RNA sequence: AAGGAGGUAUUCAUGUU
RNA sequence: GCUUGAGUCUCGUAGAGGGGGGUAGAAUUCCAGGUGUAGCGGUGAAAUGCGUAGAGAUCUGGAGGAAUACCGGUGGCGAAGGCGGCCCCCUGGACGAAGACUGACGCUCAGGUGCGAAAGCGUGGGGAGCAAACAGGAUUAGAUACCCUGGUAGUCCACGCCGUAAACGAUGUCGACUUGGAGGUUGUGCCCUUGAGGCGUGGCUUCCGGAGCUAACGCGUUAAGUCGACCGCCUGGGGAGUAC
């Protein structure tokens, strides 16, 4: 529970802020569900977009296998 | 699931950890689901039926904690 | 779109009686005020009043006798899709005189009994039983 | 849509103060400006039906406004359609 | 004017040309009357996965307020330069002039 | 695959790892 | 004449709404090699098929096409059909806050026009996977099928045609009135935000249920309740949505 974004007044998630996204991706590299993390839906969508942009910029891995 | 064998951990413990990692990643479920093509209508129907029965069970539980059976 | 305010008024009365509301409110017009006056004088509603300078609101305080609603049935007769006009001879008898039809004659709105006594016809707004 | 500066410009041109934004001539001028603007869009993107539907809504609303203005005050109607260069 | 945020990754062996590219693109924008709000040379970073067999690409981040024409020209420059390994331009609602978490 | 427990599911810190 | 219906303006919010162009990774297939040796594939069981010209398996490099795991949600958007990686350009609609403006400018709509899944048709490309037809192997009393091995049109793109679906909520559009509860999503105001709180106020949306309605099943403020406006249809089954 405890969506960690609303309590901190987060307006937009930053794809550059890797460590936060590292908290919300699993070991294999897939996105952890909002039902697990307790994140609110709007921030969940923002988080998904940011993680995909980070994957594109090679700051996070698509999967564990390639590297 | 990339499991590293740690020092002094027996083989049974390492294999248990690897099994749990695979089950947590859900690889086999993905493969079994991608073995055969399933039409979009079939996917939507299965999703809707799962939601309906899950909601019905939750509602039945909530009603049960309201009405005694004894 | 609202195209029969009189029918809307009757519908509010009917629904308020079915929902046991003390009073009902609606936008006002002079035809509505005339109808409410007729109902009040015939004893179907307990009271009416108008509140407002630019946008008057008509409030009707409804009547119940033995728990039950006083107005048993009330149906718009002349409607925008079909206007009904009756000569003085053919004015209807609602519930064989136990109820009243609201007729708009050339001298104002009145009951069927009043129009038949005054020797006038007119438009048939509604039946009330 | 139309940028804020363009809307303010048209309001100033067609309304009898800065604050009259609802007058029929102002509405028709805004609709005409937008309609003319989109012609390039629907000349390049010819399979954008979902936007062409909004375009036709704009055209129809302009038609209703012009009809009302014509039936209410013929002089304003003639002046407006002559300024805007619209047929009928 | 629109606010574009550009992140481009350069070949690790062109790290010496990276200062030149920054000035050239910034000069393009400044001549184009665009405004350079933020400019953070992140430097040599280890890739999360290999790109063209390369590792340790040189990241640069640049938040700008500049016209579409010059931005498109810059994107074509990135496309046709073989030292820039990757690029991404993103429209932003407002100018960001804070300090990136890669520097925080 | 089978069996038990908790819930509509997690707060249960971090640390450790 | 008026401002309450209908519109315009100001600032924002969310969104797989649409059109065009780029780009990324995983995977399938093919090609070129390196290693390597007798099987691979398939089924309930087999066979057809592939493989000693070296397959299958593993590693590296390349080509091309199509589709976007996780997020993902009786979540969202759209008039419906439908819409799902990320980025840019062009563009449609909706909602909220306070205020100003016009002053009935509205609703419905025969004919008419436009959009309309998939399959299909014409011309021109493209073609990795899947796969009607077809070929072969089985099963069976038979098997013109279900199963296996291949596989063409097709699926993809551009431009046109087509105009239909269990195109479904089997529920025409618009407006007003009528007890409640639990939620979801998206705005906004106030109080002590003491700390993800409490108290309101709008939009859309799922379930339960009262009065009422219903042949019953059930619907129940998003009505199938009580009414107003306009439009489409029905008149036993079949023959028949057939003939002319
Ligand atoms: Mg608009
Ligand atoms: Mg028609
Ligand atoms: Mg087709
Ligand atoms: Mg074709
Ligand atoms: Mg062809
Ligand atoms: Mg087959
Ligand atoms: Mg049909
Ligand atoms: Mg039908
Ligand atoms: Mg219509
Ligand atoms: Mg119910
Ligand atoms: Mg026929």
XYZ file of C-alpha atoms (C1' of nucleotides) and ligand atoms in Angstrom:
730
model
C 0.000 0.000 0.000
C 1.003 3.631 0.572
C 1.390 5.047 -2.946
C 4.745 6.749 -2.466
C 4.107 9.527 -4.999
C 0.994 11.311 -3.708
C 2.482 11.761 -0.231
C 5.499 13.591 -1.724
C 3.544 15.864 -4.069
C 5.164 14.336 -7.154
C 3.926 16.064 -10.292
C 5.712 14.102 -13.030
C 7.967 11.072 -12.757
C 11.375 11.561 -14.384
C 12.893 8.893 -16.602
C 16.260 10.337 -15.588
C 15.632 9.511 -11.897
C 16.712 5.903 -12.306
C 16.899 4.776 -8.676
C 13.205 5.406 -8.129
C 12.332 3.363 -11.208
C 14.791 0.727 -10.003
C 12.538 0.453 -6.967
C 9.526 -0.228 -9.241
C 11.036 -2.711 -11.712
C 11.569 -6.370 -10.868
C 14.761 -8.405 -11.241
C 13.852 -9.704 -14.701
C 13.251 -6.077 -15.713
C 9.467 -6.094 -16.068
C 7.234 -3.484 -14.442
C 5.830 -4.464 -11.044
C 2.015 -4.205 -10.850
C 0.214 -1.364 -9.127
C -1.777 -3.995 -7.238
C 1.526 -5.009 -5.642
C 3.121 -1.607 -5.161
C 0.013 0.254 -4.006
C 0.708 3.048 -6.489
C -2.167 5.205 -7.686
C -3.268 4.689 -11.270
C -2.183 8.045 -12.691
C 1.324 7.728 -11.301
C 1.353 4.117 -12.465
C 0.802 5.252 -16.055
C 3.443 7.962 -15.691
C 5.811 5.371 -14.229
C 5.234 2.990 -17.131
C 5.953 5.715 -19.680
C 9.084 6.798 -17.816
C 10.363 3.236 -17.553
C 9.828 2.677 -21.271
C 11.694 5.889 -22.078
C 14.528 4.815 -19.771
C 14.625 1.434 -21.511
C 14.897 3.268 -24.820
C 17.751 5.405 -23.510
C 19.460 2.305 -22.076
C 19.357 3.466 -18.480
C 17.318 0.374 -17.546
C 17.311 -3.081 -19.131
C 14.466 -4.399 -21.257
C 15.260 -7.844 -19.850
C 17.971 -9.468 -17.772
C 19.251 -11.641 -20.611
C 20.657 -9.147 -23.122
C 22.954 -7.697 -20.450
C 15.963 -16.017 -13.269
C 19.763 -15.892 -12.994
C 20.567 -17.730 -9.767
C 24.101 -17.574 -8.385
C 25.240 -20.436 -6.176
C 26.373 -18.895 -2.899
C 29.164 -20.242 -0.723
C 28.301 -23.072 1.697
C 24.712 -23.214 0.446
C 23.870 -26.815 -0.484
C 22.647 -27.822 -3.915
C 19.119 -28.443 -2.637
C 18.919 -24.877 -1.316
C 20.267 -23.474 -4.581
C 17.733 -25.480 -6.604
C 14.910 -24.372 -4.307
C 15.934 -20.750 -4.820
C 16.090 -21.192 -8.597
C 12.655 -22.830 -8.636
C 11.198 -19.999 -6.568
C 12.777 -17.404 -8.859
C 11.304 -19.101 -11.931
C 7.870 -19.341 -10.313
C 8.060 -15.672 -9.304
C 8.989 -14.624 -12.845
C 6.152 -16.773 -14.236
C 8.001 -18.084 -17.296
C 6.103 -21.354 -17.734
C 2.707 -19.666 -17.532
C 3.810 -17.267 -20.272
C 5.013 -20.128 -22.471
C 1.848 -22.178 -21.973
C -0.262 -19.119 -22.748
C 1.766 -18.450 -25.918
C 1.710 -22.065 -27.135
C -1.390 -21.452 -29.276
C -3.026 -18.374 -30.744
C -6.149 -17.237 -28.898
C -8.584 -14.893 -30.601
C -9.162 -11.407 -29.155
C -12.789 -12.287 -28.442
C -11.694 -15.357 -26.491
C -9.190 -13.299 -24.500
C -11.785 -10.639 -23.673
C -14.417 -13.220 -22.730
C -12.032 -15.054 -20.413
C -10.936 -11.804 -18.763
C -14.521 -10.685 -18.197
C -15.571 -14.046 -16.762
C -12.616 -14.054 -14.370
C -13.481 -10.554 -13.170
C -17.144 -11.473 -12.719
C -16.481 -14.571 -10.645
C -13.795 -12.873 -8.541
C -16.149 -9.992 -7.766
C -18.968 -12.414 -6.974
C -16.786 -14.352 -4.530
C -15.686 -11.129 -2.829
C -19.311 -10.008 -2.524
C -20.334 -13.418 -1.187
C -17.629 -13.206 1.477
C -18.724 -9.697 2.466
C -22.347 -10.846 2.705
C -21.284 -13.889 4.744
C -19.559 -11.770 7.354
C -22.940 -9.987 7.656
C -25.278 -13.007 7.921
C -24.595 -15.730 10.468
C -24.908 -19.354 9.400
C -25.394 -20.575 12.965
C -36.047 19.206 -24.556
C -38.732 20.505 -22.214
C -41.715 21.017 -24.505
C -44.653 20.618 -22.078
C -44.063 22.481 -18.809
C -47.642 21.797 -17.718
C -47.085 18.066 -18.127
C -43.828 18.430 -16.210
C -45.708 20.161 -13.386
C -48.305 17.397 -13.220
C -45.515 14.817 -13.278
C -43.769 16.489 -10.349
C -47.042 16.518 -8.410
C -47.645 12.836 -9.135
C -44.103 11.790 -8.232
C -44.066 13.864 -5.055
C -47.300 12.263 -3.922
C -45.915 8.815 -4.699
C -42.722 9.662 -2.775
C -44.603 11.231 0.169
C -42.897 14.601 -0.180
C -44.245 17.496 1.870
C -43.786 20.050 -0.917
C -42.615 20.195 -4.525
C -40.991 23.046 -6.429
C -40.917 23.962 -10.106
C -40.184 26.947 -12.351
C -43.121 29.331 -12.429
C -45.397 30.645 -15.152
C -48.788 32.306 -15.108
C -50.495 29.231 -16.562
C -48.933 27.129 -13.800
C -50.118 29.631 -11.193
C -53.648 29.475 -12.593
C -53.613 25.669 -12.504
C -52.311 25.649 -8.936
C -55.037 28.092 -7.915
C -57.668 25.792 -9.427
C -56.204 22.788 -7.606
C -56.103 24.700 -4.318
C -59.713 25.841 -4.639
C -60.822 22.308 -5.508
C -58.936 20.965 -2.502
C -56.328 18.785 -4.199
C -53.243 20.551 -2.845
C -52.835 22.137 0.555
C -51.125 25.317 -0.586
C -49.017 27.073 -3.189
C -46.754 30.105 -3.254
C -44.258 31.836 -5.537
C -40.733 32.851 -4.517
C -38.444 34.925 -6.690
C -38.186 38.180 -8.618
C -36.573 37.249 -11.943
C -36.838 33.449 -11.857
C -39.988 32.646 -9.872
C -40.211 29.222 -8.247
C -43.654 27.781 -7.558
C -43.833 25.732 -4.355
C -46.829 23.467 -3.756
C -47.447 21.995 -0.313
C -49.173 18.674 -0.946
C -52.062 17.129 0.954
C -52.519 13.684 2.519
C -55.653 12.590 4.318
C -55.326 9.068 5.720
C -51.639 8.651 4.970
C -52.643 8.258 1.324
C -52.138 10.890 -1.350
C -55.116 13.109 -2.119
C -54.589 13.190 -5.891
C -55.226 9.592 -6.925
C -54.623 10.156 -10.644
C -53.715 13.178 -12.737
C -53.145 12.963 -16.491
C -52.368 15.580 -19.125
C -55.099 15.520 -21.762
C -54.214 18.249 -24.232
C -50.544 17.924 -25.144
C -48.282 19.585 -27.721
C -48.635 16.632 -30.066
C -52.437 16.637 -29.860
C -54.455 19.638 -28.697
C -57.956 18.887 -27.413
C -60.817 21.378 -27.634
C -64.357 20.707 -26.444
C -67.621 22.539 -26.951
C -69.658 23.318 -23.844
C -71.938 20.342 -24.506
C -69.080 17.831 -24.775
C -67.143 18.820 -21.653
C -66.040 15.625 -19.887
C -67.237 14.218 -16.577
C -64.213 12.933 -14.660
C -65.049 10.174 -12.174
C -68.722 11.058 -12.730
C -68.202 14.426 -11.075
C -66.202 13.118 -8.118
C -63.067 14.523 -9.767
C -62.402 17.652 -11.841
C -61.046 18.431 -15.292
C -59.139 21.693 -15.628
C -60.474 23.550 -18.655
C -58.981 26.732 -20.107
C -61.952 28.796 -21.291
C -62.001 32.283 -22.750
C -62.481 33.821 -19.281
C -59.611 32.007 -17.564
C -58.854 28.520 -16.348
C -61.579 26.775 -14.381
C -63.070 23.387 -13.639
C -65.428 21.546 -15.967
C -68.298 22.232 -13.573
C -67.599 25.971 -13.671
C -67.283 25.988 -17.463
C -70.521 24.039 -17.901
C -72.295 26.451 -15.560
C -70.899 29.482 -17.392
C -71.826 27.976 -20.765
C -68.290 27.938 -22.176
C -65.981 25.488 -23.892
C -62.238 25.552 -24.215
C -59.040 23.557 -24.051
C -58.710 20.564 -21.716
C -55.470 20.897 -19.759
C -55.719 17.867 -17.482
C -57.925 15.454 -15.569
C -57.586 15.149 -11.796
C -59.089 12.332 -9.748
C -7.676 25.064 -32.529
C -7.264 28.830 -32.691
C -4.487 30.473 -30.705
C -5.302 32.973 -27.966
C -3.916 35.938 -29.907
C -5.979 35.101 -32.992
C -9.163 34.759 -30.930
C -8.538 38.093 -29.214
C -7.828 39.714 -32.582
C -11.091 38.461 -34.089
C -13.054 39.498 -30.994
C -11.599 42.993 -31.255
C -12.401 43.190 -34.971
C -16.017 42.036 -34.798
C -17.332 42.889 -31.305
C -18.174 46.355 -30.012
C -15.705 46.150 -27.102
C -12.909 43.857 -25.959
C -15.300 41.920 -23.704
C -18.070 40.980 -26.191
C -17.108 37.422 -27.064
C -20.523 35.825 -27.529
C -22.087 37.924 -30.258
C -23.265 36.059 -33.335
C -20.888 37.828 -35.719
C -17.951 37.052 -33.426
C -18.952 33.393 -33.268
C -19.352 33.161 -37.045
C -15.987 34.830 -37.610
C -14.253 32.419 -35.233
C -15.917 29.442 -36.907
C -15.003 30.716 -40.374
C -11.381 31.292 -39.378
C -11.049 27.781 -37.978
C -12.815 26.224 -40.978
C -10.487 27.990 -43.405
C -7.518 26.931 -41.271
C -8.324 23.207 -41.413
C -8.584 23.076 -45.216
C -4.832 22.504 -45.451
C -5.069 19.711 -42.895
C -7.834 17.965 -44.796
C -5.998 18.532 -48.072
C -2.967 16.625 -46.825
C -4.547 14.144 -44.401
C -7.521 12.903 -46.414
C -8.355 9.855 -44.259
C -8.806 11.789 -40.989
C -12.526 11.187 -40.685
C -12.554 11.665 -36.910
C -11.415 15.259 -37.377
C -13.506 15.862 -40.490
C -16.556 15.130 -38.344
C -15.659 18.003 -36.020
C -15.085 20.147 -39.095
C -18.606 19.398 -40.318
C -19.954 20.227 -36.868
C -18.254 23.615 -37.154
C -19.748 24.191 -40.610
C -23.250 23.251 -39.448
C -23.043 25.471 -36.372
C -21.991 28.368 -38.589
C -25.011 27.648 -40.779
C -27.391 27.768 -37.818
C -25.857 31.010 -36.559
C -26.074 32.663 -39.980
C -29.708 31.604 -40.317
C -30.573 33.089 -36.921
C -28.761 36.325 -37.700
C -30.440 36.619 -41.100
C -33.891 36.077 -39.617
C -33.235 38.494 -36.731
C -31.438 41.447 -38.374
C -30.850 41.438 -42.127
C -28.414 44.369 -42.143
C -25.929 42.749 -39.769
C -26.264 39.512 -41.736
C -25.417 41.145 -45.064
C -22.535 43.139 -43.592
C -21.105 40.075 -41.850
C -21.254 37.731 -44.826
C -19.813 40.416 -47.097
C -16.903 41.059 -44.741
C -16.244 37.327 -44.300
C -16.699 36.666 -48.023
C -19.178 33.803 -47.644
C -21.764 32.811 -50.209
C -25.302 33.017 -48.810
C 7.670 28.613 -28.389
C 7.881 24.959 -27.406
C 10.229 23.534 -24.790
C 12.166 20.525 -26.038
C 14.306 18.254 -23.864
C 17.038 16.495 -25.839
C 19.078 13.571 -24.556
C 21.722 12.247 -26.912
C 24.241 9.456 -26.433
C 27.562 9.696 -28.279
C 30.143 7.066 -29.161
C 32.610 6.604 -26.264
C 35.513 7.211 -28.650
C 34.155 10.633 -29.665
C 34.141 11.946 -26.085
C 36.654 14.552 -27.271
C 34.207 15.864 -29.888
C 31.366 16.075 -27.343
C 32.327 19.610 -26.174
C 32.299 20.771 -29.793
C 28.855 19.346 -30.529
C 27.372 21.032 -27.464
C 28.579 24.479 -28.518
C 27.558 23.957 -32.142
C 23.988 22.894 -31.323
C 23.629 25.559 -28.636
C 24.831 28.172 -31.147
C 22.304 26.876 -33.668
C 19.537 27.316 -31.091
C 20.762 30.707 -29.889
C 20.933 32.008 -33.438
C 17.468 30.532 -33.938
C 16.437 32.728 -30.963
C 15.906 29.656 -28.852
C 16.899 29.655 -25.201
C 19.121 27.040 -23.576
C 17.672 26.497 -20.116
C 19.552 23.415 -18.928
C 22.737 21.762 -20.170
C 24.115 18.759 -18.250
C 26.970 16.741 -19.712
C 26.323 13.496 -17.869
C 29.482 11.995 -19.269
C 30.594 8.417 -19.672
C 27.861 6.067 -18.451
C 27.766 2.288 -18.592
C 24.929 1.114 -20.817
C 22.264 -1.132 -19.338
C 22.559 -3.189 -22.539
C 24.969 -3.057 -25.486
C 24.253 -0.696 -28.373
C 26.114 -1.523 -31.603
C 28.464 -3.669 -29.488
C 29.422 -0.493 -27.605
C 29.480 0.069 -23.862
C 30.004 3.214 -21.794
C 28.318 5.788 -23.993
C 28.701 9.538 -23.467
C 25.395 11.070 -22.381
C 24.451 14.719 -22.792
C 21.166 16.305 -21.685
C 19.935 19.677 -22.884
C 16.639 21.379 -22.096
C 15.834 24.075 -24.633
C 13.088 26.475 -25.680
C 13.433 26.713 -29.442
C 11.386 26.732 -32.660
C 10.232 23.555 -34.357
C 12.222 24.271 -37.517
C 15.578 24.448 -35.755
C 14.706 21.473 -33.555
C 13.869 19.385 -36.624
C 17.104 20.484 -38.269
C 18.965 19.411 -35.124
C 17.221 16.037 -35.180
C 18.276 15.546 -38.801
C 21.818 16.473 -37.763
C 21.670 13.767 -35.092
C 20.312 11.317 -37.661
C 23.091 11.985 -40.168
C 25.942 12.179 -37.636
C 27.541 8.798 -36.928
C 29.019 9.888 -33.592
C 25.619 10.359 -31.957
C 24.572 6.786 -31.190
C 21.096 7.656 -29.877
C 18.866 10.668 -29.438
C 15.494 11.543 -27.974
C 13.624 14.853 -28.096
C 10.599 15.311 -25.836
C 8.135 18.175 -25.720
C 7.671 19.530 -22.173
C 4.878 21.655 -20.732
C 7.261 24.109 -19.047
C 10.947 24.906 -18.975
C 12.888 22.918 -16.390
C 15.889 24.785 -14.992
C 16.590 22.552 -11.988
C 19.455 20.058 -11.595
C 18.982 16.539 -12.919
C 19.093 13.532 -10.558
C 22.169 12.385 -12.499
C 23.915 15.401 -10.968
C 22.017 15.606 -7.668
C 0.715 -31.916 -9.160
C -0.863 -32.580 -3.934
C -1.608 -30.387 1.543
C -1.839 -26.328 5.333
C -2.188 -21.032 6.684
C -3.498 -15.792 6.021
C -6.077 -12.245 3.450
C -8.807 -9.641 -0.568
C -3.058 -7.801 1.860
C -0.382 -5.744 3.065
C 1.992 -1.821 7.457
C 5.527 -4.946 9.501
C 11.203 -0.286 9.341
C 15.661 -0.088 7.463
C 19.552 -2.919 8.208
C 21.108 -7.396 6.532
C 21.449 -9.648 2.202
C -37.813 42.504 -24.158
C -35.546 38.760 -20.083
C -32.113 34.786 -18.755
C -32.887 29.614 -16.489
C -32.236 26.095 -22.306
C -28.452 26.601 -26.313
C -23.830 28.776 -27.636
C -18.875 32.162 -27.469
C -14.377 33.781 -24.557
C -10.432 33.133 -20.141
C -7.003 29.127 -17.283
C -6.229 24.293 -16.708
C -6.920 18.381 -16.597
C -6.962 13.434 -18.192
C -7.151 10.180 -22.408
C -4.917 2.884 -26.729
C -9.474 9.691 -30.172
C -7.530 10.372 -35.557
C -3.716 11.197 -39.802
C 1.632 11.348 -41.243
C 6.879 10.338 -40.177
C 10.820 8.172 -37.323
C 12.863 4.748 -33.847
C 13.811 0.243 -29.925
C 14.008 -4.547 -27.993
C 12.443 -9.372 -27.564
C 10.997 -13.315 -30.573
C 9.940 -16.397 -35.400
C 12.133 -17.454 -40.239
C 16.129 -17.363 -43.755
C 21.321 -16.701 -45.076
C 26.911 -16.937 -44.044
C 30.148 -19.041 -41.037
C 32.603 -21.635 -35.913
C 32.016 -26.027 -32.678
C 29.931 -30.749 -33.030
C 27.381 -35.849 -34.041
C 23.242 -39.132 -35.051
C 19.278 -37.924 -34.605
C 15.327 -33.816 -34.977
C 10.064 -33.064 -35.403
C 5.147 -34.983 -34.094
C 1.219 -37.715 -31.552
C -2.977 -40.760 -27.103
C 0.187 -43.997 -30.112
C 2.486 -43.492 -35.115
C 3.643 -42.069 -39.981
C 4.399 -38.421 -43.795
C 8.567 -34.588 -43.271
C 13.896 -32.828 -42.102
C 19.160 -35.039 -41.465
C 25.615 -38.053 -42.648
C 25.527 -32.887 -49.218
C 26.105 -32.823 -41.404
C 20.425 -31.931 -39.416
C 18.554 -30.696 -34.496
C 21.615 -27.914 -30.433
C 25.215 -23.673 -29.120
C 27.966 -18.823 -30.527
C 28.844 -14.514 -33.887
C 27.410 -11.565 -38.095
C 23.642 -10.133 -41.576
C 18.529 -9.628 -44.232
C 13.384 -8.913 -44.022
C 8.342 -8.847 -42.508
C 4.734 -8.472 -38.942
C 3.196 -7.364 -33.988
C 4.173 -4.373 -29.503
C 5.319 -8.935 -23.314
C 5.436 -6.426 -18.052
C 2.398 -1.816 -17.159
C -3.168 -3.633 -17.947
C -7.340 -2.356 -14.554
C -16.079 -4.973 -15.156
C -9.340 1.233 -16.300
C -9.686 5.205 -20.421
C -11.064 7.551 -25.192
C -14.444 7.603 -29.456
C -21.163 8.780 -32.534
C -20.736 3.681 -33.587
C -17.142 0.332 -36.086
C -12.877 0.633 -33.055
C -8.321 2.388 -30.553
C -2.262 -0.595 -26.872
C 5.925 0.056 -27.404
C 8.412 5.215 -27.341
C 9.182 10.246 -29.851
C 7.863 14.400 -33.074
C 4.364 17.262 -36.478
C -0.948 18.292 -37.854
C -5.697 17.729 -35.677
C -11.112 16.415 -33.311
C -13.962 15.954 -28.865
C -14.972 15.988 -23.267
C -14.690 17.912 -18.237
C -13.754 21.487 -14.040
C -13.065 26.794 -11.518
C -14.633 31.965 -11.352
C -16.152 35.643 -14.378
C -17.965 38.088 -18.815
C -20.794 37.971 -23.409
C -25.304 36.832 -27.143
C -30.390 36.560 -26.037
C -34.509 30.941 -27.576
C -30.207 31.150 -31.603
C -33.534 24.868 -29.364
C -35.069 19.124 -29.831
C -36.296 15.364 -33.425
C -35.810 14.196 -38.426
C -38.854 10.981 -44.053
C -35.828 11.618 -48.393
C -30.281 13.019 -48.642
C -25.175 12.846 -47.329
C -20.990 10.759 -44.558
C -18.446 7.008 -41.524
C -18.876 1.538 -41.073
C -15.256 -5.143 -37.961
C -13.937 -9.365 -40.869
C -14.262 -11.748 -45.275
C -14.383 -10.390 -50.565
C -13.131 -7.586 -55.469
C -9.473 -4.383 -59.100
C -4.542 -2.426 -60.064
C 0.702 -2.166 -57.917
C 4.127 -3.699 -54.243
C 5.568 -6.774 -49.999
C 5.624 -11.516 -47.958
C 8.698 -13.483 -41.574
C 4.598 -16.133 -38.973
C -0.216 -18.071 -39.475
C -3.317 -20.332 -42.834
C -9.190 -21.412 -46.403
C -8.163 -24.423 -51.015
C -4.709 -28.377 -52.034
C -0.986 -32.608 -51.281
C 0.506 -36.401 -48.216
C 0.274 -39.450 -43.157
C -3.059 -41.389 -39.685
C -8.043 -42.443 -36.943
C -12.583 -44.672 -38.518
C -17.275 -49.514 -40.781
C -16.566 -45.060 -43.886
C -13.706 -39.686 -42.362
C -14.396 -35.280 -48.648
C -13.676 -33.600 -40.705
C -11.509 -33.334 -35.794
C -5.154 -34.910 -35.188
C 0.086 -34.680 -37.823
C 3.668 -32.781 -41.887
C 3.841 -29.086 -45.747
C 1.258 -25.290 -48.056
C -1.439 -21.096 -52.245
C -4.958 -17.064 -52.162
C -5.262 -14.145 -47.914
C -3.586 -11.590 -43.690
C 0.516 -6.203 -44.462
C 1.021 -1.361 -47.546
C -1.092 2.577 -51.471
C -5.340 3.864 -54.048
C -10.530 2.613 -55.200
C -14.999 -0.691 -54.714
C -18.070 -3.419 -51.130
C -21.832 -1.873 -47.214
C -22.854 -6.296 -44.364
C -22.253 -8.938 -38.617
C -25.068 -12.157 -32.107
C -22.698 -4.069 -36.117
C -25.670 -6.446 -28.782
C -26.889 -2.998 -23.375
C -30.544 -8.050 -28.396
C -32.621 -1.435 -24.591
C -33.935 5.049 -31.003
C -32.574 10.467 -29.789
C -33.565 14.793 -26.279
C -35.611 16.881 -21.667
C -37.881 17.021 -16.422
C -39.252 14.487 -11.700
C -38.683 10.122 -7.931
C -35.803 6.638 -1.261
C -30.405 4.544 -0.451
C -25.441 1.691 -0.095
C -20.488 0.138 -1.613
C -16.764 1.154 -5.065
C -13.525 2.826 -9.643
C -11.673 6.927 -12.597
C -11.041 12.410 -13.536
C -11.495 17.614 -11.877
C -12.207 21.316 -7.862
C -13.286 24.145 -2.580
C -12.706 24.345 2.771
C -10.788 22.840 7.742
C -5.553 21.637 12.023
C -1.997 19.162 5.883
C -0.847 17.878 12.508
C 1.008 11.964 8.977
C -1.125 8.826 2.999
C -6.782 12.927 7.278
C -11.720 15.004 7.712
C -15.890 17.870 5.468
C -18.028 19.329 0.618
C -19.078 20.088 -4.776
C -19.146 18.559 -10.657
C -18.137 14.585 -15.072
C -17.989 9.518 -16.592
C -18.397 4.510 -14.881
C -19.444 -1.256 -12.066
C -22.189 -3.893 -8.584
C -26.480 -4.472 -4.765
C -31.122 -2.970 -3.649
C -36.556 0.185 -2.160
C -41.090 2.231 -4.205
C -42.792 1.376 -8.796
C -42.958 -1.515 -13.220
C -42.923 -6.504 -15.495
C -45.985 -12.654 -18.023
C -41.965 -13.845 -15.416
C -37.030 -13.532 -15.629
C -35.469 -9.015 -13.968
C -34.825 -3.090 -14.440
C -34.375 -0.054 -10.621
C -31.633 8.238 -10.530
C -26.925 5.408 -16.391
C -34.931 2.674 -15.471
C -37.417 -1.532 -18.364
C -40.393 3.899 -12.863
C -43.738 8.763 -13.697
C -44.230 12.065 -17.946
C -43.294 15.605 -22.642
C -41.260 16.058 -28.155
C -39.949 13.711 -32.726
C -38.254 9.599 -35.557
C -37.805 3.797 -36.937
C -40.422 -0.806 -36.736
C -44.488 -5.315 -35.381
C -49.389 -7.740 -36.668
C -49.562 -16.423 -36.094
C -45.407 -20.448 -37.906
C -43.568 -21.647 -42.494
C -42.957 -20.728 -47.518
C -39.344 -15.871 -46.962
C -35.933 -11.578 -46.088
C -37.483 -15.869 -51.076
C -39.509 -14.604 -56.260
C -40.561 -10.421 -59.828
Mg -13.762 24.517 -29.067
Mg -32.146 7.482 -44.014
Mg -9.915 -6.945 -45.429
Mg -6.096 -7.608 -52.603
Mg -1.609 -9.385 -55.437
Mg -3.094 -28.067 -40.862
Mg -28.865 -6.494 -40.625
Mg -30.930 -5.302 -34.270
Mg -29.288 13.634 -34.707
Mg -30.460 -4.169 -9.149
Mg -32.411 -11.241 -51.812
